[PDB]
């Protein structure tokens, strides 16, 4: 009996959040698209810092999706 393999750790992903109020982000920076925020209110506030991180980045790889309505 010569065996020994183990590495199937299961972990669930976490939803995005704001950077100022860590509140429901469900939004993306309309400048770099590499940040999350609840509303423009915070975006402006935490802009002095984020700014540096924000770098002109055009849209790249897009995912597939399709919402619905009731
Ligand atoms: Zn916020
Ligand atoms: Zn940005």
Swiss-Prot record:
Annotated zinc fingers (MYND-type), start-end: 18-54
Region annotation (Interaction with DNAAF11) ranges: 8-64
Impact when changing residue 31 to Q: In non-small cell lung cancer cell lines
Location relative to the cell: Cytoplasm; Cytoplasm, Cytoskeleton, Microtubule organizing center, Centrosome, Centriolar satellite; Apical cell membrane; Dynein axonemal particle
Protein residues bound to Zn(2+) 1: 18, 21, 38, 42
Binding-site residues, Zn(2+) 2: 29, 32, 50, 54
Associated disease: Ciliary dyskinesia, primary, 22: A disorder characterized by abnormalities of motile cilia. Respiratory infections leading to chronic inflammation and bronchiectasis are recurrent, due to defects in the respiratory cilia. Patients may exhibit randomization of left-right body asymmetry and situs inversus, due to dysfunction of monocilia at the embryonic node. Primary ciliary dyskinesia associated with situs inversus is referred to as Kartagener syndrome.
Task of the protein: Plays a role in axonemal structure organization and motility. Involved in axonemal pre-assembly of inner and outer dynein arms (IDA and ODA, respectively) for proper axoneme building for cilia motility. May act by indirectly regulating transcription of dynein proteins.
Quaternary data: Interacts (via C-terminus) with DNAAF11 (via CS domain); this interaction stabilizes DNAAF11 at the protein level. Interacts (via C-terminus) with DNAL1; this interaction stabilizes DNAL1 at the protein level. Interacts with DNAAF4, HSPA8, IQUB, RUVBL2 and DYNTL5.
Protein name in the entry: Zinc finger MYND domain-containing protein 10
Originating organism: Homo sapiens (Human)
Recorded name of the encoding gene: ZMYND10
Portion of the full-length sequence here: 384 to 440 of 440
């Amino acid at each position: 009996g010569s065996s020994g393999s183990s590495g199937l750790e299961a972990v669930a992903p976490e939803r995005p959040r704001c950077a100022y109020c860590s509140a429901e982000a469900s939004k993306r920076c309309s400048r770099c698209q590499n940040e999350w925020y609840c509303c423009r209110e915070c975006q402006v506030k935490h802009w002095e810092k984020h700014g540096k991180t924000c770098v002109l980045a055009a849209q790249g790889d897009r995912a597939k999706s399709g919402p619905s309505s009731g």
